[PDB]
Amino acid sequence: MRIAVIGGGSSYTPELVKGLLDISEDVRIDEVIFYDIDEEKQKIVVDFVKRLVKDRFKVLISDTFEGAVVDAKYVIFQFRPGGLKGRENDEGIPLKYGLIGQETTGVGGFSAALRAFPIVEEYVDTVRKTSNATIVNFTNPSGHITEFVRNYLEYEKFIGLCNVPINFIREIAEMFSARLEDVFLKYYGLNHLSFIEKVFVKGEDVTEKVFENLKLDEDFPTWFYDSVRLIVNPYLRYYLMEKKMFKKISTHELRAREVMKIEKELFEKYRTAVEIPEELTKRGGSMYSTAAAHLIRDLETDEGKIHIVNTRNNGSIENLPDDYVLEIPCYVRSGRVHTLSQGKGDHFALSFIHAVKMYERLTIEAYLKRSKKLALKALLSHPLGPDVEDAKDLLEEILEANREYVKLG
Amino acid sequence: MRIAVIGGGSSYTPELVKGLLDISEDVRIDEVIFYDIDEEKQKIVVDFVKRLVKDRFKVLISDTFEGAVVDAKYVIFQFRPGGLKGRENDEGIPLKYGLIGQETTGVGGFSAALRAFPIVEEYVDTVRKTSNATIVNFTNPSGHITEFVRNYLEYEKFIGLCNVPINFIREIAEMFSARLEDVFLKYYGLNHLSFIEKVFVKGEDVTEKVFENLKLKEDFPTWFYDSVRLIVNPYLRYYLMEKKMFKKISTHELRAREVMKIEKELFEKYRTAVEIPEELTKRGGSMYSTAAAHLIRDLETDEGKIHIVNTRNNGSIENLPDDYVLEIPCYVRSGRVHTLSQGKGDHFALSFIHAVKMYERLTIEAYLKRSKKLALKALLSHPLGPDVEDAKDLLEEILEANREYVKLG
Amino acid sequence: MRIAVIGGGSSYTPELVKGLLDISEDVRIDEVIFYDIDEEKQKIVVDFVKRLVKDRFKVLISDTFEGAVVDAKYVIFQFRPGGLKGRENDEGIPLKYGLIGQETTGVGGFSAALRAFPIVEEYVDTVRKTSNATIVNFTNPSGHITEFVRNYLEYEKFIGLCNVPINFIREIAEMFSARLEDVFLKYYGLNHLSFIEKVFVKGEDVTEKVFENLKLKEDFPTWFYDSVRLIVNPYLRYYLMEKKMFKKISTHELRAREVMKIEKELFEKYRTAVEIPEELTKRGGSMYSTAAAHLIRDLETDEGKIHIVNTRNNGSIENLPDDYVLEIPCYVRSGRVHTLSQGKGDHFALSFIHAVKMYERLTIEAYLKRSKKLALKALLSHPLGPDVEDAKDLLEEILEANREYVKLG
Amino acid sequence: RHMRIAVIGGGSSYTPELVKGLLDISEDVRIDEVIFYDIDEEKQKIVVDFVKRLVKDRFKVLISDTFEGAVVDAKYVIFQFRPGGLKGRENDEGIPLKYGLIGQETTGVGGFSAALRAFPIVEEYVDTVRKTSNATIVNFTNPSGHITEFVRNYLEYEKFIGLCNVPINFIREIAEMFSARLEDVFLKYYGLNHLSFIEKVFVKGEDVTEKVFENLKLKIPDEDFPTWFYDSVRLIVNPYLRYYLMEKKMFKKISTHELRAREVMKIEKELFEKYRTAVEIPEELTKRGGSMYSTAAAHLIRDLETDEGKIHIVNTRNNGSIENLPDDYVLEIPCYVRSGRVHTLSQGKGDHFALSFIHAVKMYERLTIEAYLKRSKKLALKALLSHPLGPDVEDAKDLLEEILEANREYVKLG
């Protein structure tokens, strides 16, 4: 059994490796092989990895992408198209037009996606022509990419992950002194655009208790939970509190800048660190890798476990089309991911899901036709996208900034 | 055969009557009966109407709604819940929050709907229990009210009308020196939120020619039509050019106030007019008349003719739910309206249609439950609604302004 | 404008030509070109045709299928795969097994379809690579072939026709002394498996009077119409009165043998006839001609007219999948066929439609895979098919008899 | 936390097996009392006295004189009564025969008259449960899938779970074949109760479908589907499909042998005599075809009580389990069962061959329910004609009349 990691130089790799080590007493892992376009960076992160693993498994570096995935049972997509410079443009350029600039949400999600599609296209193609492995995806925007792979590349074994579900389950498990697996949710939406309607702990409906603990400037007021009656992904603030979020983003250093500082600091510690450092929580992406590990674990056994994952709706939410990729709770058993019935989704949640899904497909369509025209159409459709008067200048600036990664005609 | 007109005192009534006189050669009309809450205003209008009609058919006033609709085959809703004063509040109140203020679109449409629902609820109930007439609805917001009547009151014979379709058809017929019925459209969306994908004149696909013509003709730039490839309802400006529209509305006289002036000038003229005054074109409701008379005419015969009308999708647009009320082309014959297959809707169009439909149903739900909390939820879901920080104060202003017409708890 | 007729040697050809001559005053027809695998038989018929036509248009014979369809705007499929010998096997073989033997219904329909599929595959392929004509199909089983072409060959411009709708409309038109176009139906089902729920004449619901008339008229008893409340295709007798129909078919001359006789008498008459002989009424295919000519006519103009036709459901019946090919009323205008909203189908009708549609697809699957195993599966799925104990011998007998036309492994 | 199970039809001869099942799960979940109700007090008393001897005071065993008294404080209610008794079953099987029609307890015309007898009793019972305990109802009463369609979609009582014994019997057979546990076996399984199909078989995650098909060929002779059938159809079929696909053979069998209902009366009279003194469940209870219904119900209740999450094949709304069937079809399908809830699992597309039966019988089911709700003789004729195994037009009226006269104590149609 071999796991390939694509983006082995990530500063989260130590966390992933820890995760793999914890399951490696319930599932046989013979090797973990790392690939990165940045050989010097990766070497450092993998050298640390090897001091953590201590021969419990083989740890390998492949010079090529093919060479990693060729024997792999699982491939983890962990790379950042365009680097932190890409992310800086994603965050900074939309501001100049009065728009939300954010890594995965709105115009920033649009350019990040455009940079991501050609790489995942090449990579999915290689995996399919070789090992036909299950691909586990962190690369953002993760739900958008999952929509693209499942419904346009039509590669079934591509599972989109993100950290908000596991984080929420962890808050709840802590809140009620229970295990993660004791928590069961009615959960649906898109990646970074999700809604929680019911919370169960050990089978007890604790939704009401959860709402009340949520009440006890930049967080939803109490009346909001009373009115909407959904627990809402924090990313919904960019939609529902746009003016407040814009004011925050536009008066401080960019978020990419400060993660870049956290990373540099981590890398320095990784040169000599024998234990995983603490400053690896100052990263808002924590627990992504723990979600990954538990997922691979439960894909490998025949126990049958629940994981909230990006995949085709297939009836999970009865009033959304089957083909919508959503972030939803699934029954994971023996290489298979089974969608679970949840009933109906709330009209308030659907107003966002529908809108952003349409935007997602228009973006993909623009990409496949490499069309500037269609890209403007996609940009105009996003609930946080430009007005007509700014749209064409915005796109121009995105294309200029991203010309090493995206070419549209 | 009797036609009831509810809101007889409308300044558009003369044009409606002209329309009715024109089809009166094709179909038998024995009487037109008028009802209005404002008897003195309606009396001047109806006196003028009698002068135009010259006993072509009987013209009556009923002192009650019930008296107007009891023996009617067709009932026309052309009343304005809350009057021009309500429209003034609709337009003016959102402005201080940085929000679009407009008669039918956005927050203004929300308050207009809340004023409309109790009145239409009583009116539909009375029609249903008496004549079971077909109701033809102009009252705004027309599509939203149709969604309410068809899907919540479950009165089948309620047809929402608007004047955009017939005006577009007219423009095309003039462009190509053809008759109205020669023009056939792939047309879908919501009332004031509609899209044209294909134009046929005498069977020829002339879509390109129409796009080419739009460029020669506050409007969407040429690249917009190249990009989006849809002909767009002018009201889409409020979504797509929000900043530009907000600036325009907020630095000029409220539309409601200019209509007040226009109406006062029309009413003085109506006292002695022998013919319809040209000044009735200063209103933006022209051709509403033709649309209603033509619909009634083709409801009466067994010919079978196409009318674009607000009704349940029923498979007109295959990637939208059957139950969505849409404004779409239907085959109209002998009292029945049959939806026509049109294929798939464009994702760009769907992004708007879905979001606003979810807003429509949230608004209806808040009304049916008489719920302040659910009204907040509805308001937040509109693409043109308030941020969380403004929503409470805005709703409280709306409910205070409309306290005579609606009560939420 | 050119119309291709495939199977020119048909005894119905003269009637088709009469139909085409009748529309030739409303629409331009330059030439009708005939193709048949039996040159000598066709020549006799075509020579007769020429005497009827009077050079009103050009009458041509093509030596090849390709030569017939190359410049054609319309292509009429009116050929019988395997001839009346095939039909004889169709009707006779299932009787030994205690099964209904019939040209289009049940096991006979199965073997008839198998014979047809290779020929229509080649033909549809040639048409789509050349003229891309609209194909109008008489060839039985018509609905089944339509399902094959629309959903498996994916050729959109294939319209399946049958003569029961037009004959039923004619019966009603005559009952109420009205024109064909005055009659409007709620009609749905499969070809030879159809149901009428509502009858309108000039807009008036006359359904009750039709039911009342049916009882003043092997037929369904009065109580049947009272209980089921559907007017039923006469072919439903083979399902609902199987025992009676079996007894009838099995104690009388096979219908195929009778039509051999009839055809031999017609063909001798055609040598000298100046007008269409009355003896052509002895065939049950009458009015097929009007149905096709009228369809072609209304496909050619921009009027918009109703024709009952085999095409994709597309929301016409809301509780049947969109992709079911059904026989339903459509609005036909300028080369397009639009499906019309009809509401819900009756569960009694659905019981038959679903089961036969599943049989249809199983049959197509078996053909596409050239699979004997899958053919057994298809055979067993038919409500009038063999029990398990007879299936193998029955199929073996069918494949042996049709060895020249179908090869399964 | 004190937990009570009601058993409706306590006098059933399967009750001892149900109790054995409940005893077995009583180590994993707390059961404080099992309360029994039956319309036939004297028959139930013999069975319950035997039950008390087996329970050995592990939980309280009670008899309620009324239905209401049984269900009032119940967390689970088990429907295991036969409307009209074995004499209703006798009429069900016997009456269609003279018309050349299949006569069977649950399938075809017999199922139709059985459903009509059941509907009024379940209507009353579900109404009482809903107005008191709002318990989960676990249903054995036949026809079980049809009654679930009726309760879920027309009475709109969500917590009604239809059960049958074929899924568990199949799962047991597979587990035996491969030396595995029941829970190691996972199926692509769908259809209607007594009208179900297996497309895929997994044991400990391995696809063993082929091996299972190969095994079927090696395995009541003239009544099994021949090998070519499995090669052709490529579905493992519920044995009840024999009545549809082997109709002439099944009609001949049923009509030239004693009515099953009459043999069951003999079997039952021997069981009841034994229950007077029995210390252990008699082997003669296997002579009944209902075995393992017990385990299925107890295992269901067990996993409804914990927060583990386990798979049970159960009758419930499709909700996307089979993507090419409507969501609202009640089907018999694998569900994730956890903490009082039943979640449907994605299975992909159903086979057209299977859909031909499922659609036709589902339409028949709803037409039957509609006839009953309107108390309509006309609509009952229409339902009867819709069933693949129903009468030709020429027989439908006389057949319906016979059925209504035999069932006049239980149903009245106008």
Ligand SMILES: NC(=O)c1ccc[n+]([C@@H]2O[C@H](COP(=O)([O-])OP(=O)(O)OC[C@H]3O[C@@H](n4cnc5c(N)ncnc54)[C@H](O)[C@@H]3O)[C@@H](O)[C@H]2O)c1
């Ligand atoms: N790894 C996690 O647990 C985690 C957590 C949160 C978010 N993410 C998402 O995963 C992605 C990685 O983010 P990160 O935080 O690890 O930052 P990161 O910048 O350290 O990215 C990881 C590595 O990917 C490499 N890379 C870039 N392009 C590549 C390509 N074409 N092929 C192979 N490698 C390439 C980079 O050299 C870098 O070392 C981002 O899109 C991020 O949003 C991951």
Ligand SMILES: NC(=O)c1ccc[n+]([C@@H]2O[C@H](COP(=O)([O-])OP(=O)(O)OC[C@H]3O[C@@H](n4cnc5c(N)ncnc54)[C@H](O)[C@@H]3O)[C@@H](O)[C@H]2O)c1
């Ligand atoms: N008349 C048209 O063809 C037309 C054209 C464009 C828009 N509309 C829509 O239809 C409505 C009519 O507005 P308008 O500008 O024509 O005229 P308007 O504002 O003068 O109102 C029409 C009449 O309705 C009456 N009215 C108010 N409430 C009523 C009630 N509860 N019952 C009966 N009558 C009542 C008023 O007294 C007035 O005489 C508006 O909602 C408008 O958006 C109508």
Ligand SMILES: NC(=O)c1ccc[n+]([C@@H]2O[C@H](COP(=O)([O-])OP(=O)(O)OC[C@H]3O[C@@H](n4cnc5c(N)ncnc54)[C@H](O)[C@@H]3O)[C@@H](O)[C@H]2O)c1
């Ligand atoms: N023509 C009509 O208006 C009409 C009416 C009823 C039914 N049909 C259907 O259409 C078909 C024709 O019926 P029919 O009574 O004329 O029978 P038919 O025996 O007269 O056959 C018609 C002609 O088709 C020709 N033919 C056979 N195979 C061919 C092939 N592969 N390519 C081209 N031509 C071929 C035959 O030689 C024959 O001349 C049948 O399937 C029938 O069910 C047609």
Ligand SMILES: NC(=O)c1ccc[n+]([C@@H]2O[C@H](COP(=O)([O-])OP(=O)(O)OC[C@H]3O[C@@H](n4cnc5c(N)ncnc54)[C@H](O)[C@@H]3O)[C@@H](O)[C@H]2O)c1
């Ligand atoms: N019990 C099981 O595990 C099992 C097994 C196979 C099939 N079934 C289905 O369950 C039902 C009962 O099966 P059975 O073989 O035990 O039959 P059964 O004849 O023994 O009936 C069971 C009990 O129900 C009682 N009863 C009848 N009407 C009642 C009513 N209205 N209220 C309460 N009790 C009533 C009878 O007195 C009898 O004691 C049948 O419908 C059968 O098809 C059950």
Ligand SMILES: O=P(O)(O)OC[C@H]1O[C@@H](O)[C@H](O)[C@@H](O)[C@@H]1O
């Ligand atoms: O700013 P960062 O440290 O990169 O964290 C950003 C991360 O935040 C998490 O809450 C989101 O769910 C992730 O999808 C995202 O990658």
Ligand SMILES: O=P(O)(O)OC[C@H]1O[C@@H](O)[C@H](O)[C@@H](O)[C@@H]1O
């Ligand atoms: O300002 P007004 O004269 O009232 O015109 C307002 C009107 O504008 C038209 O363009 C809309 O289609 C109408 O539905 C609307 O009511």
Ligand SMILES: O=P(O)(O)OC[C@H]1O[C@@H](O)[C@H](O)[C@@H](O)[C@@H]1O
């Ligand atoms: O027996 P025949 O003369 O060939 O007539 C048979 C014809 O009967 C009609 O009622 C059917 O609608 C046709 O589809 C069929 O071909």
Ligand SMILES: O=P(O)(O)OC[C@H]1O[C@@H](O)[C@H](O)[C@@H](O)[C@@H]1O
């Ligand atoms: O004749 P019986 O003993 O009543 O057994 C009949 C039983 O057989 C099983 O195979 C069925 O799954 C049961 O639902 C049925 O009731």
